[PDB]
Structures are given as structure tokens and as C-alpha cells.
Ligand binder design. Structure first.
Ligand code: HEM
Ligand code: HEM
Ligand SMILES: N=C(NCCC[C@H](N)C(=O)N[C@H]1CN[C@H](C(N)=O)C1)N[N+](=O)[O-]
Ligand SMILES: N=C(NCCC[C@H](N)C(=O)N[C@H]1CN[C@H](C(N)=O)C1)N[N+](=O)[O-]
Ligand SMILES: C[C@H](O)[C@H](O)[C@H]1CNc2nc(N)[nH]c(=O)c2N1
Ligand SMILES: C[C@H](O)[C@H](O)[C@H]1CNc2nc(N)[nH]c(=O)c2N1
Ligand SMILES: [Zn+2]
Lengths: 407, 410
């Protein structure tokens, strides 16, 4: 059926048909919605490859052409002979860009077409991966003028020769469980921070220690590598009015780079495909700094501001939250490091949504993830009905490597 | 089938079995989620089974399932339906049904209070004047001079669909809205259409910024009638700030009693089209939505100016800063005038405790994440980190089309 999506702030109604092309399951049913759940053969391969190629040739205005038929049959024969196939560079680039385009949880998709794709399919060792990663980090960082990019390592074969980046993000801070029972550094990485130790790393036992890369090539055991400190751009956090802010000793990295997801293109699976863009202010100030299970710094900032913390009704938590986020955006803009505020980011997404509806007939979006973690209703996306569904190519979650690896 | 729900902040995992008793559809499919969509005369046939389900639930609740009383009631109702095409609920069943419709309301964060609902039986009402009296008594009871008490008033159920009882107002108390020929709006933009209907029906509008609308009441399917709610019964709170003396000069105020009056209460197959209910406000409803929505009073700018914030670039978060102070103002004003109100931190914390309790004693708690998470400071409230399952259980409250779109004028 043809579904319609309305914006209750502007009355604008959009009709969605793109969902009719969805193939994967959402996790919901006619009786139950699981919209807030974080994680809901040669015979299988060709139809997938066919699906992909058809849309590829359709995008290049050559659907049903000789070239299309030729390619479709070449891949077909290749699969029947090699149980798999290889994507042309042009197809790989198209696929990576569309996987981003179809990422329902990403609010920054208005940038989808500008993706720089690095073909790392000729890689064979961990030192090789380290080289490709350093180059990606340096390219995307661009002295502070961040550029979107993704590096694609060799596709899956027999499931035993998988390339995998063990880190969840190329750049993250370590976490250590102290005697006090408390946590030093980022609590979210405690476990990983230990697998590094349990592997050889020499943790400076610090609050903000950039973790090392744990690279896995061809299924072998992962190796560690220190990212050239000179390549890891960091920003000191200070408030544009509270001189005492710098005394908190807070800093964060400028390059957000997810490295544990799986890129699926035409049936082929790329288990190591780290990608990076740039931060939206709230990701750091609200989630990394204020989540109770993270650096949880609200009380500290609350105290230094001297606001009544006796009653929650004084909204001291809210007041403190705003100041921390103003500081983050100020520190990044002052160090000339790319970053976008939730107001600007959400405005762009709405524009992107309208473009996608009139050009592709729709745009899968996960409201739960798209609406910012603070000031939700004062951003335009809060009032925008959204339809979530899965389209391929796509980025998927996958089990951690240390829970499936056979040393 | 068992369904696990996890809180990523506490790692506490809960198991849901209650969904197995869900019957109504959600709108979602196995290929698409419609979780963020605002809006996703029965026959004797589909009536007794609906009646049976409810009665079994009721007798099981009082530990009398299978009792002679339980069996006799089923026979009584069956005979009634086949004999008259419908049936009448006993007072006890109505109270149980009303409380559970609230308990099952997936979009309500105030459910920890469900068992404390005061139910007023207005099923003997026959005229609009009759309805007005019942509503006035409800408003006075619930207000209780500022110490708000939850309540619901239930008018006669639907019969053939042509004698419906309806409260045309969306809320018992709301401010009028007026569109100016220059395109601007005086008052609350959200109530312009209804305000026009009221004027056309003869209401003499004072055309101000905060004029309490009159009640438009429909009884027995007849044309609706206008009634002014006694001013002395409408509790209002002047909004001021604890530190900003200029805030009060913004001339802002709001009523203390939120009273939804356009929903349909479904109990055991019976439909009650007029069932106004009220509780008390959570601060953000007024401060964030009624005052700051671009399509409502939209006071962000004026407030940001007076605070002299840097409004040249959004990156200064002047909207966020102004938003917090306005919400501080709302909470402070209500508490000072001793009118019940709850902040979002307290309300969401209570909901989490309610939800965990329900999972243990009931086996589940349907919840709509999109609606439960507050419209400001989302992630610093426990609910943001709580996975929730949304499904429909009956008794329940449902939306129904606006009466002016379906009413046959006499
Ligand atoms: C251009 C700048 C970009 C911005 C402003 C942006 C912003 C966002 C934000 C705010 C989120 C939510 C993060 C979280 O809460 O964990 C997100 C998620 C995501 N983005 Fe983007 N993004 C950008 C670039 C990218 C790129 C380059 C790709 C891939 C090629 C991408 C793929 C995704 C995916 C797959 C998710 C969901 C990840 C998950 O489930 O953890 N994004 N993005
Ligand atoms: C004790 C005070 C109560 C509080 C703090 C509370 C709070 C809330 C809030 C914050 C919402 C969302 C409002 C919106 O964004 O439009 C809501 C919705 C709702 N509540 Fe409660 N509530 C309370 C009492 C009640 C009562 C007495 C009932 C019924 C007997 C009830 C039934 C519902 C329903 C059905 C909805 C959804 C209405 C809609 O879809 O517009 N609530 N409540
Ligand atoms: N802006 C981002 N954001 C995505 C990565 C940063 C994000 N703030 C983060 O820490 N994501 C983690 C933590 N929670 C997610 C999960 N799925 O559990 C992954 N990416 N980009 O390429 O520009
Ligand atoms: N706290 C409430 N809140 C619900 C009523 C107030 C709410 N803020 C409101 O104005 N609801 C309207 C506007 N949006 C809803 C809709 N369905 O479109 C109804 N109720 N209570 O019983 O205590
Ligand atoms: C339980 C709930 O799904 C979870 O807390 C989600 C909510 N929305 C989110 N939205 C974004 N962007 N990022 C997140 O990590 C989350 N967490
Ligand atoms: C489109 C989206 O569903 C809509 O804006 C919803 C979001 N969450 C909400 N949550 C509450 N409590 N109240 C609302 O009116 C809404 N509006
Ligand atoms: Zn759903």
C-alpha cells in the first residue's frame, strides 16, 4: 500500500512508496511494536546480486541494456563457478554510498553523495590494515576540516577468514576498573581496554587514553597498533564564559569513526568497513559526558555553577546540560574542527527527507534515533512522522569478534 | 513466546508475557515500523466474545473466576445482548474498566497513579444541560483548590450511532484562538477552528490572549449547546520566574487542570464516546509544548531577547537556554500557588518504577517510547535508556474523529 507521512508543525504530507521495495524484517508485527529496541548459499546469492545490479544499472540509466545483461550473466557464471563474485569499483562506490543513504538511524544523510570510498580489498595483513586506517584517519581529519570517508577491506569468504577491526570506533578512550570500585576513564570501554592489556598494551592508566587498534586480517589473531598521536586530533573543552570549565580537564576527539559494523552489498558482506563523518554536538556533550554510565559529569558541573541540587524541580540538571553542550560546540568551533549543532543537523535532515521523497519516493528513518537527546521538540524532526524499514545495500550490527574468534 | 526488554543504563532485563493478550493491531508490519505515526455500531456477533473476555478479566481480578457469580453474570449478559443487542455494565465493572483503560494507556507516563482514579457515573444523563452539571462537578472535584485529584466522568454509551454523547471541546479547559486578517493569530493557534465553531454557535468572544473557551456539549445525538464554565471553577496560574523579575511582564498564565475530553473509552465491547478525564500536569507539557511549539504560543524569541542571549547563531544554543528558564518558571509558578504539578525528572523516574512493578505483578506494561520520553532533556531521564514494548490491550482509550466532521445537523 501507499503510506503517507505528515509533519504536524507544517502540515506538509509526503507519500512513501520506497518502502514497498523493502526486503528485510523490521522486528515489529501487527500486534507489537519494537521500535525502541536497540537490537531487534549460491542460491541465496544470485537473487541478491540481481537485485543490486538492477538498481545499479537503473541509477546509471542503462536498465535492460546489453551492458546490464552482460554483467548480470558474468556475475551469474562467476557465482556458479566460485560460489561468489567481485564488485566492479564503480559498483562498490555506488553500494557504499547507498548503504549510507539507507541508514535509517543517521541524521547526517544529506551528505550521502559526497562519500570518499577507499578500496582496501587488496589488503592481506594487519600492518596493511593499519596503513589503510592511518591514511583514512589522516584523509578524513583534513587538519580539522573533516571529510566523510569509508575504507572497505576484503569481503567475507568462508567465515573463517574475516577481516575485523575489534575497536568499536577507530578512536576511543580507555576504561579501567579501579580499587575504589569506581571507574577510571570511559566505562563503556572497560572490557575492550582489558582485552588490549590481556593482549600486550601498556595502559597509561589515564582518564582520556586513546586506545590502540586491534586489527584482524584473514581470521588470524588481532595485533595492536598505536595511532600516530600526531594523527589523532583532539579538542580541549572550555566554556566561553565559565573560566572554571577548563579545570574539569575535559577533552574529546574530533573524528567519530564507527568501525564495527558490516557493510552488505549485493549479497557480499564486508565485515571490516570503518567509516567517519563529523560530530553533532549533542553526541559528546549529552551522551558521552552526561550519560550516567559514561563520564557522568553533571553533578561536578552542577556544583561549580552553584545551583540548587536539593530538588529536581529546579531543573539544575537541565541547566547544567545546556552549558556543557555550549562548551563542546564552542571548543570545536574555536579549534577550527568541524562539528554541527542539533538544530542545524535536524534542519538538514528535514530538507534531505523532502528531497528523498520527491526523488526516490521515500526515506527510511528511525524517529527514536533521529530526534536529538536534548531539546527534542524544539527541533523540526520531533514533529515529523517517519517510516522505518530496511533497504539494501546497508550497514548492519554484528557480534563482537572476541565472542566468536578462535585463537 | 517471551520478549526481553533491556535498560541500557542499568543493564536490568525484563520479560514480557502480557503482550500475548494483545488483540488490536498496531499499524506496524514485519516489513515496516510505524512507531512514530501520530494516528495509526457493533453487531451482536462480535459483542458477546468481547463482553466475555472483559468479564473473565474482571472476575479473575477479584479472585472469583469460575464462581457461580461469574457464571451467572455471563448468562445474564448473553441474554441481554441477544435480547437487546447490547448490555449494561454494573457500577463495579465500570470502575474496573475505567481504571484499566488508564493502566493500559501506552502513551501515558503518569500511570503509577492508575489505581487511584475517581470514577463518576454519568450514565443517567439525558441532556446537554445535564452534561454541563456533571462536568462542572468533575472540574470542582478534580481541582480541589489546587490539590488535584484524578477523575473521569462517563456519559451514556453508544447505542445505534445516531444518539452519541460528545464533548466537542478537545480538553474541558483551553484558550481560544483567533486568526487575524493580517494572517497573525491572537491566543492559542491550535484552537482556531474550534473557536470559530463556538462563535458561529453564538459565543461572544472577548478576543483576548487567554480566553477560556465555552463548552460545546452534545447529548443523545442532538445539536451541541454552549455553556460557560463558572470562572470561579477555573484555576489559573500567573507565570513568573524565581530570579527574572521581567518574566511576569510577559503576561503569561495557564490553567492548572489538564482534562482530555475527546477520546473514546472502550470497555467489554461497549463504546463511551464522552468520557472526560483529568489528572495533573507534567511541567514540560506547558513549558515546552504549549509555550514553545512554533505552532502554539511560540514565545522562545521574546524570552531569548529579554535574556539578551546571542541569537545570531543557533550554535550558541539560545533556544535551549531560553527553554530551560521558561520551564523553571512554570514549575516555580505552580508550586508557589500550591497547584499540583510534576517535573519530568520525577515523573519519568516514577514511571520506571511503575513499569518494573507491572512487569513483575502483571507480566508486562505496554509503553510508547516516542510519547513517554519528555520533549526536552530526553537522555538525562531514565526512560530514554529503557527499551519498551508497545501493544494494545483493552479496556482502552482511543481517538475518534472530530464531531463537527460527522455530525448530522438537526
Ligand atoms: C557527515 C557527517 C555525519 C553526521 C553529522 C552523522 C550523524 C549521525 C548521528 C548523530 C548518528 C547517531 C550516533 C549515535 O547516537 O550513536 C549517526 C548514526 C549513523 N550514521 Fe551517520 N553521520 C555522519 C556520517 C556518517 C557516514 C559517513 C556514514 C557511513 C558511510 C554514516 C552511517 C551511520 C550509521 C550506519 C549510523 C547508525 C550507527 C549505529 O547504529 O550505531 N554516518 N550518524
Ligand atoms: C496523574 C496525572 C497524570 C499525569 C502526570 C499524566 C501525564 C501524561 C502525559 C505527560 C501525557 C502526554 C500528553 C501529551 O503529550 O499530549 C499523557 C497522555 C495520556 N494520559 Fe496521562 N497523565 C495523568 C493522568 C491521566 C488520567 C487520569 C488518565 C486517564 C484516566 C490518563 C490517560 C492518558 C492517555 C489516554 C494519554 C494519551 C492521550 C493522547 O493520546 O493525546 N492520564 N498523560
Ligand atoms: N557522528 C557519527 N556518529 C556515530 C559514532 C559516534 C557515536 N556518538 C557513538 O559513540 N556511537 C556508539 C555508542 N552507541 C552506539 C550503539 N549502537 O550502541 C555506537 N558518525 N559519523 O561518521 O559522523
Ligand atoms: N497531563 C495530562 N496530559 C494530557 C493533556 C494535555 C496535553 N499536553 C495536550 O494538550 N494534549 C493534546 C494536544 N496533543 C494531543 C493529540 N493527540 O494531538 C492532545 N493529562 N492528565 O490527565 O493529567
Ligand atoms: C532504549 C532506547 O532504544 C535507546 O536508549 C536509544 C534511544 N535513542 C537513541 N538515539 C541515538 N541517536 N542514539 C542512541 O544511542 C539512542 N539510544
Ligand atoms: C511525529 C511524532 O510522532 C509526534 O511529533 C509525537 C512525538 N512524541 C510526542 N510525545 C508526547 N508526549 N506528545 C506528543 O504530542 C508527541 N508528538
Ligand atoms: Zn514498530
Amino acid at each position: 500500500r501507499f503510506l503517507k507521512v505528515k509533519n504536524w508543525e507544517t502540515d506538509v504530507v509526503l507519500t512513501d512508496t520506497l518502502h514497498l521495495k523493502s526486503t528485510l524484517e523490521t522486528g515489529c508485527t501487527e500486534h507489537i511494536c519494537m521500535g525502541s529496541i536497540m537490537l531487534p548459499t549460491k542460491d541465496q546469492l544470485f537473487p541478491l546480486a540481481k537485485e543490486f545490479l538492477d538498481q545499479y544499472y537503473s541509477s546509471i540509466k542503462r536498465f535492460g541494456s546489453k551492458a546490464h545483461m552482460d554483467r548480470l550473466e558474468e556475475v551469474n557464471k562467476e557465482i556458479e563457478s566460485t560460489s561468489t563474485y567481485q564488485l566492479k569499483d564503480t559498483e562498490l562506490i555506488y553500494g557504499a554510498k547507498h548503504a549510507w543513504r539507507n541508514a535509517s538511524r543517521c541524521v547526517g544523510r544529506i551528505q550521502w553523495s559526497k562519500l570518499q570510498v577507499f578500496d582496501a580489498r587488496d589488503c592481506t595483513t594487519a600492518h596493511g590494515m593499519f596503513n589503510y586506517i592511518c591514511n583514512h584517519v589522516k584523509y578524513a581529519t583534513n587538519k580539522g576540516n573533516l571529510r566523510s570517508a569509508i575504507t572497505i577491506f576484503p569481503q567475507r569468504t568462508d567465515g573463517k577468514h574475516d577481516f575485523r577491526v575489534w575497536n568499536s570506533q577507530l578512536i576511543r578512550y580507555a576504561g579501567y576498573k579501579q580499587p575504589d570500585g569506581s571507574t577510571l576513564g570511559d566505562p563503556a570501554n572497560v572490557q575492550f581496554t582489558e582485552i588490549c592489556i590481556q593482549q600486550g598494551w601498556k595502559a597509561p592508566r589515564g582518564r582520556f587514553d586513546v586506545l590502540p587498534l586491534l586489527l584482524q586480517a584473514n581470521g588470524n589473531d588481532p595485533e595492536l597498533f598505536q595511532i600516530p598521536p600526531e594523527l589523532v586530533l583532539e579538542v580541549p573543552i572550555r566554556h566561553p564564559k565559565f573560566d572554571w570549565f577548563k579545570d574539569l580537564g575535559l577533552k574529546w576527539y574530533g573524528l567519530p569513526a564507527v568501525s564495527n559494523m558490516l557493510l552488505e552489498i549485493g549479497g557480499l558482506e564486508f565485515s571490516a568497513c570503518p567509516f567517519s563523518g563529523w560530530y553533532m554536538g549533542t553526541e559528546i556533550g549529552v551522551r558521552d559526558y552526561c550519560d550516567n554510565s559514561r563520564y557522568n559529569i553533571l553533578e561536578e558541573v552542577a556544583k561549580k555553577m552553584d545551583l540548587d541540587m536539593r530538588k529536581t524541580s529546579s531543573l539544575w540538571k537541565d541547566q547544567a546540560l545546556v552549558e556543557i553542550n555550549i562548551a563542546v560546540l564552542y571548543s570545536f568551533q574555536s579549534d577550527k574542527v568541524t562539528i554541527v549543532d542539533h538544530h542545524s543537523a535536524t534542519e538538514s535532515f528535514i530538507k534531505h527527507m523532502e528531497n528523498e521523497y520527491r526523488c526516490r519516493g521515500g526515506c527510511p528513518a528511525d524517529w527514536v534515533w533521529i530526534v536529538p537527546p536534548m531539546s527534542g521538540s524544539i527541533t523540526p524532526v520531533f514533529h515529523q512522522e517517519m517510516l522505518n524499514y530496511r533497504l539494501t545495500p546497508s550497514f548492519e550490527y554484528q557480534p563482537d569478534p572476541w565472542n566468536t574468534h578462535v585463537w
